Amino acid sequence: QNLKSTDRAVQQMLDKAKREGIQTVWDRYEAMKPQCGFGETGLCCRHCLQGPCGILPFGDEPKVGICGATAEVIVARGLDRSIAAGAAGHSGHAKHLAHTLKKAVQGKAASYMIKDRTKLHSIAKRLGIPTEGQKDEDIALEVAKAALADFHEKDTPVLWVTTVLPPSRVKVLSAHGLIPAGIDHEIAEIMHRTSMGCDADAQNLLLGGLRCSLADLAGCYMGTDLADILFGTPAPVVTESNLGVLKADAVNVAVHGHNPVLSDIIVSVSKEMENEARAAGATGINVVGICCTGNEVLMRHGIPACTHSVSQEMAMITGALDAMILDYQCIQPSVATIAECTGTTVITTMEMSKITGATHVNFAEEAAVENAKQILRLAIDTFKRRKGKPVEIPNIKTKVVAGFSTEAIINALSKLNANDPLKPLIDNVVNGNIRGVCLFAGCNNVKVPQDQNFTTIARKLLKQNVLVVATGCGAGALMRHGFMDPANVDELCGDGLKAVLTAIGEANGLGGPLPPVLHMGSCVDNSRAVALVAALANRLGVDLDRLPVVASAAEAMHEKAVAIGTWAVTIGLPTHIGVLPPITGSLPVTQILTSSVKDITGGYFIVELDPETAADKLLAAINERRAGLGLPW
Amino acid sequence: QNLKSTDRAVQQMLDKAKREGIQTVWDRYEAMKPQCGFGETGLCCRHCLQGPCGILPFGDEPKVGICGATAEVIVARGLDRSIAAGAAGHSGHAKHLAHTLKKAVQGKAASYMIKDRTKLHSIAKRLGIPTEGQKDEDIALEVAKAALADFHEKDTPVLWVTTVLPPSRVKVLSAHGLIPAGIDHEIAEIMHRTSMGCDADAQNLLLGGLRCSLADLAGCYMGTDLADILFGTPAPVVTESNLGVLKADAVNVAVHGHNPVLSDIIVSVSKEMENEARAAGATGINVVGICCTGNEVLMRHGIPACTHSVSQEMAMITGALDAMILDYQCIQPSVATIAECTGTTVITTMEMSKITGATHVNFAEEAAVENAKQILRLAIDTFKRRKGKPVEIPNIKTKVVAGFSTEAIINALSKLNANDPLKPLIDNVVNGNIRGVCLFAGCNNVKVPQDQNFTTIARKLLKQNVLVVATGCGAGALMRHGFMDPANVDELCGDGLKAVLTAIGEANGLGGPLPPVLHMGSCVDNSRAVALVAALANRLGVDLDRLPVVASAAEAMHEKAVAIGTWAVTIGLPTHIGVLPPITGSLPVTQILTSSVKDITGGYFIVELDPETAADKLLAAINERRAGLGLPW
Ligand SMILES: c1ccc(C[n+]2ccc(-c3cc[n+](Cc4ccccc4)cc3)cc2)cc1
Numbered sequence A, B: 001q002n003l004k005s006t007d008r009a010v011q012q013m014l015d016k017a018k019r020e021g022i023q024t025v026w027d028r029y030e031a032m033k034p035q036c037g038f039g040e041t042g043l044c045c046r047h048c049l050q051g052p053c054g055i056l057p058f059g060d061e062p063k064v065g066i067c068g069a070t071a072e073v074i075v076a077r078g079l080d081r082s083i084a085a086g087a088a089g090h091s092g093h094a095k096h097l098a099h100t101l102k103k104a105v106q107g108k109a110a111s112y113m114i115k116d117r118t119k120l121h122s123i124a125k126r127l128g129i130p131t132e133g134q135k136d137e138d139i140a141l142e143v144a145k146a147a148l149a150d151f152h153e154k155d156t157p158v159l160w161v162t163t164v165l166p167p168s169r170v171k172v173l174s175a176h177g178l179i180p181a182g183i184d185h186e187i188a189e190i191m192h193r194t195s196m197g198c199d200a201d202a203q204n205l206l207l208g209g210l211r212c213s214l215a216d217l218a219g220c221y222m223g224t225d226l227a228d229i230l231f232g233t234p235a236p237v238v239t240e241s242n243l244g245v246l247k248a249d250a251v252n253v254a255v256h257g258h259n260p261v262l263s264d265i266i267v268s269v270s271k272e273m274e275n276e277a278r279a280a281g282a283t284g285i286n287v288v289g290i291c292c293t294g295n296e297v298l299m300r301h302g303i304p305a306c307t308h309s310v311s312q313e314m315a316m317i318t319g320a321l322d323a324m325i326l327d328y329q330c331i332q333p334s335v336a337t338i339a340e341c342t343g344t345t346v347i348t349t350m351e352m353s354k355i356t357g358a359t360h361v362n363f364a365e366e367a368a369v370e371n372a373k374q375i376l377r378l379a380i381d382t383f384k385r386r387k388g389k390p391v392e393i394p395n396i397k398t399k400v401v402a403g404f405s406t407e408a409i410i411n412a413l414s415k416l417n418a419n420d421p422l423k424p425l426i427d428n429v430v431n432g433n434i435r436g437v438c439l440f441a442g443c444n445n446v447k448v449p450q451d452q453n454f455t456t457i458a459r460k461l462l463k464q465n466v467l468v469v470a471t472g473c474g475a476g477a478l479m480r481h482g483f484m485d486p487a488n489v490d491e492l493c494g495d496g497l498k499a500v501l502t503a504i505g506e507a508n509g510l511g512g513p514l515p516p517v518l519h520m521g522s523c524v525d526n527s528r529a530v531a532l533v534a535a536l537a538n539r540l541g542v543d544l545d546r547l548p549v550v551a552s553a554a555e556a557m558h559e560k561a562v563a564i565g566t567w568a569v570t571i572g573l574p575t576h577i578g579v580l581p582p583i584t585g586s587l588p589v590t591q592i593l594t595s596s597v598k599d600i601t602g603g604y605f606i607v608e609l610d611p612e613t614a615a616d617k618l619l620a621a622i623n624e625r626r627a628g629l630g631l632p633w
C-alpha cells in the first residue's frame, strides 16, 4: 500500500476498497502491465488508417512509418497533439468563463457579477481598454469581447500572451515566430500540420509546438483573470486538507472538476440551504473539494480540500460522500461505476462532459442558483439513505494556508517596503537567504507513489533556502502532507528562507511565518506564477531566462501538464518533469527539448524520474542562474 | 505486383524500384506487419502519461482503461480526434484561401484577382451580403470577412453549414444540437472533451463528433467557393492521366498537395518561362500533377494528372521528374529521401509544412510570381543534369474528361430543359434510366490493391444505371483506369444511364456521351456534390435522407476521409467505407455508426471490406431510397 500512495488516509481507504472488492485506479494499472514500449516511448502513430505504425526503439525494422515518417517526426507530431489537447482544455475553461462574464454584464445571468472591480480595471488598462469614464458593465463587456477575440485571428496577436510577458521575452519569442495568432487558431493549425502528408520536420514541428504552448499559457491567464473578476482575487485563508475534512453527520458534497462557474455558486447557495439540511437530520451541508475546482473554492472561500487526482475515488470509499458535482477534467469516469457500490450520487453538469451512468443536470448560468438548489437537495436526499449507518472516514487531516495570490503575495511583501514590495524579496535573493524560486505544478500519476516526488524534492529545496510555490495537484500533494502549515517551517525550511518567511508572515498580522509552501491556486492559476515571475524580471530589467526560477511538474499525468511544461520552457525557465514523456524514442527530439531549446527560449526540460537527482538538477539550474547574475551560491 | 496496385504503369515502376533497391510504400507496409490489434481496432488510448492503455477485444483483462474509460468511450474519443484532425486540414486550406482573397482585394498580392465574378456575387447573395451598389473588391472583402468569421463564435452559426443545406436538413441537425458554432471552435472543443477526465459517454461523444464533421463540411465548401472565386469555376476539360503524361524531353514539374494558391500561379507563370526552357534544351515546362492540387489544376486548366496518393513516389522512379512542388497534405515525406536516388528536386513552400532534407521556398502571395519564377528555374536546372541520359516512363496513359462542376453539370442539363435543368435528371430518375447517384470520394490505401475497390464497385454501379460522380483520389483512381473516357460508356454503362449520358453530352456540342464518371474535383470539392445533392432535395421538397444518393470512400486513408464520411452520414446519406475504421473494438460505437444514426440524421455507415458486397449494399441502399419514394426498382 506504501507502493501506491504516501497518503496515509489514502492507504487506509485502499485497504477498505480491497476488503470490499471495489476496484481502484492502482488495480487497473496493475491489470494494464506490461505496457507498450512503442506507446510509452512515442514510437507509435495512428494518424492514418494505413495502419497503426510503430518503430522499434532499436534493432531492425520497423525503422520508419509507412508514409516515410521518421521516428523524430512521429514523436514530434504526437507531442504536438498532446500540447494541442492541453491548450484546448484550458481554452474551453477560459472561454466558458468569458461567456459567463458576458452573460453577467448583459443581464442574462443575475447569479454572476463583477466581484473584483480593481482586477477588472487593471486588466482593462493592461489590455489598453480605457476605464475612466466607462460604466463597469461596459468595460467588463469590453474585456469579455477582448477575451473572446484572442481565440481567432485579428490585428493584434493573443494579448494574453503579449501583454503578460516582459517586452524582452515577447521580443525573443517573436524573433522565432512563436507568438500565437489565436488560441483556437494555434490548436487547429497544430491539428492540421500533424495530420498525414503535412509537416514532416522535427525542428519545424517543435517550433509550432512551442507556439501552441503559448496559446495554452494565454488560456490559463485568461481563466485566472476572468475567475478573479467574477468570484474574487484570492487572499490568504486557513482550512484543512485530506479526507478528515469529511464529517459523517453532514451532507458531504464534493465539487470536482476545474471550472468555478458552477462550484462557487454551489458554495454560496449551500449555506442558506443548511436551513433545510437540518431537517434532513444532518448538521448542515459540507462542501468538501476535489482537484482544481476544489482548490478554486479553497483559494477563494476557505473550503476544505478533500483529496486530489489519483486518489479521487478514495473520497467515495468512506461511504459518507453524498454528492459529487462534476464540471470537467481529470475526473476518472470510474467514479460513476464505483458509486453503485458506495451509494454516492454522481452528478455531471456540462453538456460536453457526460459519464455513462452518472446523473446529468443541464447547468446554465441563467439558472445557476436553480440548478444548485436542486443539486444540493439530491445530496440531502442521498444523506437520508445514510441515516443511522456505518462509515469509515480516516480520522486524518492537515492544516493548510492558501489564498496566496500574486496580489496577496505582493501586498504581504509591501509591509516590508511600501514603495517597492519586490525589493525585500530581491534583497534576500541577493544575500543568499532565498536561493531561488521553484513552482511545483502538475498532476499526480498512478506510475508514481502518490505525492512522493513533490514531497521529496520539496524537502530538498526547502532545506536549501528555495522559495517554493505550488499549484494544482502539486499544491494538493504538498498540502495533504502539511507543507502549507507554518508550524512545520521549523522542521522544513533552511535558516535564510525561515528568516524571510518569518519576517513577512509576522509583519502581516498573521503572527507567524508564512507557510513552508505558497499555495498559488489551480492549474490555470499557474499563470499567477507567470505574473509574479514576469514582475520580478521587469524589476530586474532582465528576461525570465536569467532568473533563479524553475518549475517542476513532478508527477505529471494530463496533456495539460505537458502543455504547461512546454510553455514554462518557452518563457525561459528550467522545467523538470518527473514522469517519462513520450519523447524517448527519438534522440534528436529529446536533445531539442533538453539542450537545443536553451538557444531559442533560454528554458530547457529536465527529465529525471529519480526525485533526488531531479532535486539536485533543479538546484544546479538555480545555481547556474545565480552564477549568471554574479551572485554567491 | 498485382497484389499492390492494379495500375499497370505503377506495376512497371514498382519493378524499376525493386531492381534499383529504392524503397516504396508497399515495402514499408510489409516491414510493418504484423500490425497491432489494439490500434487497428481502436482499443488503445494515449491521451495520458498514465501509460498507453489497451483493451483486449475479447478475453480477460485489460478490460478497461486505467482512469475507468470503457472500450466505447476510448474508441469514440479516438474517432472524434480523427474527425477533428480532418476538419483542421480542410479549415487551414480554406483559411489560407480566405487570406489570399483578402490580400488580393486589398492590393497586397497583385498576382491574385477575382476571376469568377458571378460566383462571388452568388456566394454573397447566399450569405446575405448585398451586391447591387457595391464595388467588387468591397463585396469580395465582405465575403472574405464572412469566411474568416465562421472559424470562431458570433451571432450567426457557421454559415458554410447553415446556408448550404436545405432548411429541413438544417432543422434536423439543429434538433440534436449538431449545428457548429465555429470551425476552429468545434475543433478545439473536440480536443477538449476527448482529453482525460472530460466527456466519458459514447453517445454524447459521437454527437459531438457529428457536430465537428459539419465544421469539416463547412471548411470544404469554403475552400471550394473561395477557389472558384480566385481561380475560376471548373468547366469541362479533356486531358490525359497516368505517368504517360510525362515526357522525357521537357522540364517535368509536378504540383503536389492540395492548395491551388501556389500551383495555379505556377501553371500560369510556367508557360511564359517556356521562353526560357527552350534554351535549357527542353521543349518546354511540363506541369504534370499529383493528388488534389493536381486535380485542382486539372479541373481548371486541363493539366494532365500524373499520379495519386499511394503511388505518388512512382512519379520519381521514372527519373525524368525534375521538380516536386509541395504545399501540404497526403504527401509521403519519403519522397524527400527517395529524391537522392532519383535526382528529383523536392520543394516545400509552406512555413508550417516542411520535410527534413527537402528544399524550402518561403512562399508568399505577395511574391507569388517571384517565387514561381525561381522555382521553375530550379526544375529547369534539374533538367540540365538530365541532359542526354536514360529514363523509364511507362508508355501508358488514359483519356480523362473533367471540369464537371455543379455549375457545368447544371448548364449541361439545362440544354434539355432551359427553365428547369434539374427536371431531366429527376425525370430519368423516375423512369428508371438513372437508378441512383453515387459519389466516389476518399483516398487510396496501401492495405487495398490500388484502385481495386473504386473500379470494381464503379463497374457494378455503372452496369445498374447509377449516375456516378467522383472526387479526390477516388476520381484519380477512376480516371487512371479510363472511367472518364466517353469511349468506354459503351463497355461500362447500362442502357438507361447510357441514354441519359448520350443525350446530355451530344446536346452540349460535345458530340458524344458524357464520360462514364463525372469527375467533380478535389477532396474539398466534395462540397460540390453537397450543393448538387442539396439542390435536388430542394427541387423535390424532401430531405437528403430521402434521395437515392450514397457515398463510398472506398479506399480511405486520411483523417480527412473519416471526417468526410462522418459528415456524409450527418447530412443524411448512406456512406460506405472500404477500409477498416478504428471502431471495431466497441460493438456499441459500431452499432451507432451503422444502425442508430439512421434515427438521428437519416444517414448511416456501411463498413464492408469486400467491394462486391459493398456494391450490393450500396445498391440496396439506393433501392431502399427508391422504395421510400414509391418508385420502381
Ligand atoms: C533507471 C531505471 C529505470 C527508470 C524508470 N524508467 C525510465 C525509463 C524507462 C525507459 C524505457 C524504455 N525506453 C525506450 C528507449 C530508450 C532509448 C531510446 C529509445 C527508446 C526509454 C526509457 C523505463 C523505466 C529510471 C531510472
Ligand SMILES: c1ccc(C[n+]2ccc(-c3cc[n+](Cc4ccccc4)cc3)cc2)cc1
Pocket: B041, B057, B058, B580, B584, B585, B586, B609, B610
Ligand atoms: C473477411 C475476413 C477478413 C477481412 C479483412 N479483415 C476484416 C476485419 C478484420 C478485423 C480484425 C480484428 N478485429 C478485432 C475485433 C473484432 C470484433 C470485436 C472487437 C474487435 C476486427 C476486424 C481483419 C481483417 C474481411 C472479410
Ligand code: SF4
Pocket: A045, A046, A047, A048, A049, A050, A051, A052, A053, A065, A066, A067, A068, A069, A074, A196, A197
Ligand atoms: S499517417 Fe503515416 S505515420 Fe501515421 S500511422 Fe499512417 S502510415 Fe503511420
Ligand code: SF4
Pocket: B045, B046, B047, B048, B049, B050, B051, B052, B053, B065, B066, B067, B068, B069, B074, B196, B197
Ligand atoms: S487518459 Fe485514461 S484512457 Fe487515456 S491513456 Fe491515460 S489512463 Fe488510458
Ligand code: FES
Pocket: A036, A037, A038, A039, A040, A044, A045, A052, A054, B036, B039, B044, B046, B052
Ligand atoms: S503500438 Fe502500442 S501505443 Fe501503438
Ligand code: FES
Pocket: A036, A039, A044, A046, A052, B036, B037, B038, B039, B040, B044, B045, B052, B054
Ligand atoms: S497498443 Fe498498439 S496502437 Fe497502442
